[PDB]
Amino acid sequence: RRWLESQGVDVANGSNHLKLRFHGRRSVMPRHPCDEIKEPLRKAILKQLGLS
């Protein structure tokens, strides 16, 4: 989770799930920093944010 919230994607407004937008592409994910973030989440998220 330190890696996920970093370069490129913009982490803007939100309350529960974070709303991350990347130059016209959109995705959410949980915040909960101490739980383990799953790889299938990371692939769905990176795919949602880097294809049209």
Binding site: G14, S15, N16, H17, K19, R21, R26, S27, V28, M29, P30, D35, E36, K38, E39, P40, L41, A44, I45, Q48
Partner: protein, 138 residues
């Protein structure tokens, strides 16, 4: 309005929550009961994007027997439906205000999920949009 949730279990121990209709809505949870709780939270959040980006919200695919699903509250479903009507009418937010007779400030928070919804206001907004909001059953 019920969104079918796909939950693909990850070998790491638990489940991963997906929604075939809402690509932004992505999360997971470690148990069945827990993963559905995160599902509601993740989907309701994903809705915020469309109100922000003034684009149509995809309505749920029809339910199949034994589907997991999140039932969206009427408070959310009413404005989810409101957003879609507003866009396809191509009316301005200011033009809708004159027809409603209310100032821009209260028309704005119709198209936002982070405030209480007064159902009559949504119904009245639908009417001005040329749409008809009604309740059935019970």
């Amino acid at each position: 309005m019920r969104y079918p949730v796909t939950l693909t279990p990850a070998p790491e121990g638990g489940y991963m929550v997906s929604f075939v209709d809402i690509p932004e809505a992505l999360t997971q949870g470690e148990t069945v009961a827990e993963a559905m709780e995160a599902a509601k939270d993740a989907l309701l959040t994903a809705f915020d994007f469309y109100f922000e980006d003034n684009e149509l919200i995809p309505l749920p695919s029809p339910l199949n027997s034994h589907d997991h699903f999140i039932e969206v509250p009427l408070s959310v479903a009413s404005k989810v439906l409101l957003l879609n009507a507003f866009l396809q009418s191509e009316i301005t937010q200011q033009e809708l205000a004159r027809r409603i007779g209310k100032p821009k400030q209260e028309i704005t928070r119709l198209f936002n999920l982070h405030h209480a919804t007064k159902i009559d206001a949504v119904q009245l907004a639908a009417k001005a949009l040329g749409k008809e909001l009604s309740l059935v059953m019970v």
